[PDB]
Design a protein around this ligand. Structure first.
Ligand SMILES: [Mg+2]
Ligand SMILES: [Mg+2]
Ligand SMILES: [Mg+2]
Ligand SMILES: [Mg+2]
Ligand SMILES: [Mg+2]
Ligand SMILES: [Mg+2]
Ligand SMILES: [Mg+2]
Ligand SMILES: [Mg+2]
Ligand SMILES: [Mg+2]
Ligand SMILES: [Mg+2]
Ligand SMILES: [Mg+2]
Ligand SMILES: [Mg+2]
Ligand SMILES: [Mg+2]
Ligand SMILES: [Mg+2]
Ligand SMILES: [Mg+2]
Ligand SMILES: [Mg+2]
Ligand SMILES: [Mg+2]
Ligand SMILES: [Mg+2]
Ligand SMILES: [Mg+2]
Ligand SMILES: [Mg+2]
Ligand SMILES: [Mg+2]
Ligand SMILES: [Mg+2]
Ligand SMILES: [Mg+2]
Ligand SMILES: [Mg+2]
Ligand SMILES: [Mg+2]
Ligand SMILES: [Mg+2]
Ligand SMILES: [Mg+2]
Ligand SMILES: [Mg+2]
Ligand SMILES: [Mg+2]
Ligand SMILES: [Mg+2]
Ligand SMILES: [Mg+2]
Ligand SMILES: [Mg+2]
Lengths: 205, 85, 80, 82
RNA sequence: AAUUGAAGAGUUUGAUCAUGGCUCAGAUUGAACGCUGGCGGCAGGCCUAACACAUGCAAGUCGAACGGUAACAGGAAGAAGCUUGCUUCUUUGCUGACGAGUGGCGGACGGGUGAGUAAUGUCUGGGAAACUGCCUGAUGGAGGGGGAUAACUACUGGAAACGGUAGCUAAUACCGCAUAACGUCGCAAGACCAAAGAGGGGGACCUUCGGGCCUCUUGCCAUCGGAUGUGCCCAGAUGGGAUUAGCUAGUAGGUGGGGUAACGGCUCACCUAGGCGACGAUCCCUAGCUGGUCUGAGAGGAUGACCAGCCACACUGGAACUGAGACACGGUCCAGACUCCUACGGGAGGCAGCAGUGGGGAAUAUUGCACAAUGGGCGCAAGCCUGAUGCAGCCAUGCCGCGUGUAUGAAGAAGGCCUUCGGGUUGUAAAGUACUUUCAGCGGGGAGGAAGGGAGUAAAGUUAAUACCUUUGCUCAUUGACGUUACCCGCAGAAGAAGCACCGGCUAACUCCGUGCCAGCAGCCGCGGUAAUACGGAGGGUGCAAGCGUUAAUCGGAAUUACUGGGCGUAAAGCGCACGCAGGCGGUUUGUUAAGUCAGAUGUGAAAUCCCCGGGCUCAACCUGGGAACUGCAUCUGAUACUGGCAA
C-alpha cells in the first residue's frame, strides 16, 4: 500500500520539494536535491510530451502518498463530478482526511499526519476515523483524541504548521487540538506549481 | 422409490381402477344411445339418453369427467335424435 | 370496430379459403431506405364473393381453420 | 393463494427487505406482482426504515391476499394512522 | 440535476506522398500459468465430459379425518416393592403421546442444467373460444342408508426384494338414495346432478353417564363471482449458407360426426384442388430467448456466468396414470444402455439437488453449521420438515479499504557500483537518536440482526353466559447458527508483514563487465562477428505494488465492411459487349386517398441494472429511498407538404 522507501529520492527526480521530510529544516540542501536522482541523475532528460505528462501526475501522486489504483479512481471520480475534471481531481485529493490532518498542522509530514489517522488518534465530528482516505467535507470537525493529545510529535507539528503559509478553508485551534473544514478549497488556494490539465491529458487518451 | 409417498404410487392405482370402471360404464351407456340413433329407433334413443343423462351429470359432479364434458354429450345426442327421430 | 386491415385478394380460387395480400412500407432498420414488406393472410369469406384482385377489408377473429383467424368485413372495387 | 411477504435484498449481515405481493409459490426473491413497501431492520434510530403503502396492501388483502407473520407485525407497529 | 461527448504511435522508401496490411498505447475477464504473497469487507468459483457416480443429506406433515397400541411416559380398580408414602409389575390405550397402517394436504413448489429447439421458443404488441388447488365476495345446502378394506389375527412361500390363503374392522376411503337452482341439456314443456364430519367450552332438564342439548370454531356440497395461475390464436421481430430453388396427401380449404377445459385438420369421412416459396420456401449448418453484460463519443461490435423473467430437459427412447395442476428431477409402466446386491432361484438403482468421488482439463472449493432470520410444505395450535435459505470453510479470482511503520538523523560511515582517480552514486538510505502501535498476537468488556411465540391477567367481539374461541393491551420468564460477532478497553514491542516487470525506438528509466551471427533476445521495427544502454550478470534507474508479469479472450483505436463513415483510369476493384424479365427509381397539373410520413392523446415498455440527488455500513467497495431513462411497441384522433394508391 504505502510507498515506504526513501522519501527525498522522490523530490529529487520530480524536481521540486514535496515536503516528505516536511519536518524541521527548509529549502532542502541537507539532501542534494536536483543534480543526481541516480547514477546518471545529472544528465538532462530532453524528455517527451509523454514524459512531462507522466511526471506531473507522478509529482501530485508522490505528494499525497497515493498509489496508482486510488489515484486513477480519483480521476475517474473528478471526471464524473460536474465542472472541470482537473480541478475536482485536486478537490477530492484535498478532502482526504490524512491530508486535512497534516494541513491543520497536527502532523509534520503528510505521512506522519497519516500514521496519526491509522492509529485511531483522530476524530471527525466526534467519532474515530482510522482510515487515511476518509473524505472530509464542509463543516466537518477533526480533532486529536485526548488519549495521546499534546504528545511529542503533534506539538512540534502544530508548531511549524504556522511556519507554513497556513490554509484558509479551515480553522485550527491548537488548544482543543480541533479544526473545522470550512469550505472545499477553491482552485486558487494551493498549487501554482502543479499543472492539472497535464495529468488530465495523461488519463484522457 | 424409497420415499414415503411410495404410498402415493399405490394410492394413485386405487383411484386408477376406480375411475377405469365407471369411466367405462359411463361410455357404455353413452354408446347405447348412439346405437339406437344409428339404427333409426327414436324411442330407444330417448330411452338411452334418459338413462345416460343422469350418469353423465353424475360422474361430472364427482369429477372424473368435469362439467362441460357432460354438456356436449347431452347436446350432440339431443341434436342427433330429433334430426329424423 | 377493433382494428382492421385491407389489401388486395391474390387468390379466390378455393372454397372460402380466400387469401389476402397486405403490402406495407418500412424503414430498413440499418440503411434507412423504405422497402415493401408484404403479409399474406388466410381469411374466411362465406358464400365466396371477393374476387382475385378485389381490395377488401379484414378483421381478426378466433381460429376458424388451422391457418384462419381472420374474416372479411366488406369489399372494395372489382374488375381490377 | 397470493401473499404479502418479505423478499430479502439485503447484503451479508446487513439485511434489507423488499416487502412484496406475489404468487405464494414463487421464490422468496423472485417473481412478484408489485412492491408495496420495504423494511430496513437495521434502519436505526436516525430516520426512515419501514415505509409501507398501506393503501395497496389492505386492498390486496381485501382483494384476497394474505400476510406474513412478520409483515402484519410491521403493521401493528407502524400503528396505521399516526 | 439525470448518456452535456470523440487524440494517436511503430513499420514498405535513400528519401517522399499516397495506397495497405501487420503492430502498440485503452478498457474488459467466471480466467490459467511463472514469480511472489500480510490483514480485512463485498462478491465470484467445472467455461471442459447433458461424462460416470460410492456414501450422508435435498419432502414431508396432520392423533383436532380413522381402527388404533409397539416404543417411553405417566398414571389405575387392583396385585404390592415395602425403608407406611419415597414406591415395584401384572396389567389396563385410561391419556401425554406415537412405530406401522387407512385417510387429507403437499411430493407439478422451492432447487439443478441448457441437451433439444431458428419456432408447440423468446421478445413487442394484441386477440377469443377456456380451465383454474389452496385464499377470498355472495347465496343455499348440509338428509337418510349400504356394501367394503389396510392395519390386524391364523396358517404360509422366499437369501432378499417382496409375497399367498383365509378370516376380521374405523373413518373426512368408497357407493346408492333422497333433496335439485340463480347449475347442466332443452326454443319450451320438461329432464337430469352433491355432500362429511372433527374439535373447544358449557345452564337448568334428563339420558343406556358414552352423550343428548346449548354454544361458537373449523372442515364438506352446490352455483355465480373475484384474485392468482395456466391453455389457446394473431401480427412483427428474433442467427448463417443458393457450392440448397422449388416444397407440400391431412397437405390447403369446405361440409358432417367425433373429440378437448376450450377455438381449431385436433381427429375422421366425404367434397373442393388447394397451401407454401426468390420479401428466401424446402434442405443443410449452428443456437435456448430476454432483461441485460462488456466495449464504443455515438452508430455500432461482441456477448447471454453470477441476479430476475420466459422456455426446455431430469440416464436414453417411448407412454400414459393420478391429480386443480405432470405426461411428473429424488412417481408408475415398456424398451434400451449401464451399474449394484444374490444363498443363484431372483431382486434393485440414476447427483444436470447439497457436499463428495473417478474421469476429462491450463483450471474451478467443505462429504461443515443452523432453521436464529426471510421464505415454502403440513398442522387450530404449539410444532415438524426445508443442502430453499441464512451462515461458516477453501482459492489474491476479482473489486474496495488498510497495513508492512513516523519523525529525526552527514561531510554523507562501511560495502557495492561508476570514475577521466579529483571525485560521483546508492543516500536520509543504513546505523544512531527520539516517537507512534492501526493490523496480526494476548487479555477484558460488549450492540444489532428478535419479530414472535409461552404462561398468565385485563378489556372488548360473541353466546345462557362472566366458558370457549378471536381480537387488542398488561405484566412476567423466554428464544442467535453466524460467534473467540461487529464495535469498545487494556497489554507488549517497530516488534509478525515486499515482491514482480521493465529501462534500444514505439515507451517512463544507463552504465560497466561477460559473450562475440555463439549463447541468446524479440508485441512491431529489429538486437548478437571485440567498446552490446537490445544477449547474460551486476550497480543504478523507471513503472507497479500484495500483487507483478506471461498466455488466452471481446471491443477499442480500425474511416481496416465506410448506415452514421470509404472506395474502383495508373495502387485491391467496372461483367468483353449488348437486349431485357423481376426488382429499384421515375418529368409535369388537378382532384381524391391517407398506407408511408408528421402531430397529439392513451396504454404499455417487470423488477434489478445504467445514470442524477440523496440516505446507511469508520471510508470505500457494498447496501438503500426517490427520480430520471427505458431512444420501443400498440390503439384512437387528427394534420396532407413529401412518398405510395386511385382518377383524369
Ligand atoms: Mg489494493
Ligand atoms: Mg360438434
Ligand atoms: Mg531503411
Ligand atoms: Mg505460490
Ligand atoms: Mg403416527
Ligand atoms: Mg369423499
Ligand atoms: Mg340424485
Ligand atoms: Mg353420507
Ligand atoms: Mg366440425
Ligand atoms: Mg445447443
Ligand atoms: Mg470510434
Ligand atoms: Mg446458482
Ligand atoms: Mg421421458
Ligand atoms: Mg385427468
Ligand atoms: Mg437425482
Ligand atoms: Mg452436486
Ligand atoms: Mg488431470
Ligand atoms: Mg445453496
Ligand atoms: Mg565509498
Ligand atoms: Mg488484533
Ligand atoms: Mg439481539
Ligand atoms: Mg430491538
Ligand atoms: Mg525514454
Ligand atoms: Mg527482456
Ligand atoms: Mg562489451
Ligand atoms: Mg468500425
Ligand atoms: Mg479505402
Ligand atoms: Mg488494377
Ligand atoms: Mg467495360
Ligand atoms: Mg425497469
Ligand atoms: Mg457515506
Ligand atoms: Mg400524390
Amino acid at each position: 500500500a504505502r510507498y515506504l522507501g526513501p522519501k527525498l529520492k522522490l523530490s529529487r527526480r520530480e524536481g521540486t520539494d514535496l515536503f516528505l521530510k516536511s519536518g524541521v529544516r527548509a529549502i532542502d540542501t541537507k539532501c542534494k536535491i536536483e543534480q543526481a536522482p541516480g547514477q546518471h541523475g545529472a544528465r538532462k532528460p530532453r524528455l517527451s510530451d509523454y514524459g512531462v505528462q507522466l511526471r506531473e501526475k507522478q509529482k501530485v501522486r508522490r505528494i499525497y502518498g497515493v498509489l496508482e489504483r486510488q489515484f486513477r479512481n480519483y480521476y475517474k471520480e473528478a471526471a464524473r463530478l460536474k465542472g472541470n475534471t482537473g480541478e475536482n481531481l485536486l478537490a477530492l485529493l484535498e478532502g482526504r482526511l490524512d491530508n486535512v490532518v497534516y494541513r491543520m498542522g497536527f502532523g509534520a509530514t503528510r505521512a506522519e499526519a497519516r500514521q496519526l489517522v491509522s492509529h485511531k488518534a483522530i476524530m471527525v465530528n466526534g467519532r474515530v476515523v482510522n482510515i487515511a482516505s476518509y473524505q472530509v467535507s464542509p463543516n466537518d470537525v477533526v480533532s486529536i483524541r485526548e488519549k495521546a493529545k499534546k504528545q511529542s510529535r503533534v506539538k512540534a507539528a502544530l508548531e511549524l504548521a504556522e511556519q507554513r503559509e497556513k490554509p484558509t478553508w479551515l480553522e485550527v485551534d491548537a488548544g482543543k487540538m480541533e479544526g473545522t473544514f470550512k469550505r472545499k478549497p477553491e482552485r486558487s488556494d494551493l498549487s501554482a506549481d502543479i499543472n492539472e490539465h497535464l495529468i488530465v491529458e495523461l488519463y484522457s487518451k | 422409490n424409497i420415499k414415503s409417498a411410495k404410498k402415493r404410487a399405490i394410492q394413485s392405482e386405487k383411484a386408477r381402477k376406480h375411475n377405469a370402471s365407471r369411466r367405462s360404464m359411463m361410455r357404455t351407456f353413452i354408446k347405447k344411445v348412439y346405437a339406437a340413433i344409428e339404427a333409426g329407433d327414436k324411442a330407444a334413443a330417448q330411452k338411452a339418453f334418459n338413462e345416460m343423462q343422469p350418469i353423465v351429470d353424475r360422474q361430472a359432479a364427482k369429477g372424473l369427467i368435469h362439467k362441460n364434458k357432460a354438456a356436449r354429450h347431452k347436446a350432440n345426442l339431443t341434436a342427433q335424435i330429433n334430426k329424423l327421430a | 370496430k377493433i382494428r382492421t386491415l385491407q389489401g388486395r385478394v391474390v387468390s379466390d380460387k378455393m372454397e372460402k379459403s380466400i387469401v389476402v395480400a397486405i403490402e406495407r412500407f418500412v424503414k430498413h432498420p440499418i440503411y434507412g431506405k423504405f422497402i415493401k414488406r408484404t403479409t399474406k393472410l388466410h381469411v374466411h369469406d362465406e358464400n365466396n364473393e371477393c374476387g382475385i384482385g378485389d381490395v377488401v377489408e379484414i378483421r381478426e377473429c378466433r381460429p376458424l381453420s388451422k391457418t384462419k383467424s381472420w374474416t372479411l368485413v366488406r369489399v372494395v372495387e372489382k374488375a381490377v | 393463494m397470493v401473499t404479502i411477504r418479505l423478499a430479502r435484498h439485503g447484503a451479508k449481515k446487513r439485511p434489507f427487505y423488499q416487502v412484496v405481493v406475489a404468487d405464494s409459490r414463487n421464490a422468496r426473491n423472485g417473481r412478484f406482482i408489485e412492491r408495496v413497501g420495504f423494511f430496513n431492520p437495521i434502519a436505526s434510530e436516525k430516520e426512515e426504515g419501514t415505509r409501507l403503502d398501506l393503501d395497496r396492501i389492505a386492498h390486496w388483502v381485501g382483494q384476497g391476499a394474505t400476510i406474513s407473520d412478520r409483515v402484519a407485525a410491521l403493521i401493528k407497529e407502524v400503528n396505521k394512522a399516526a
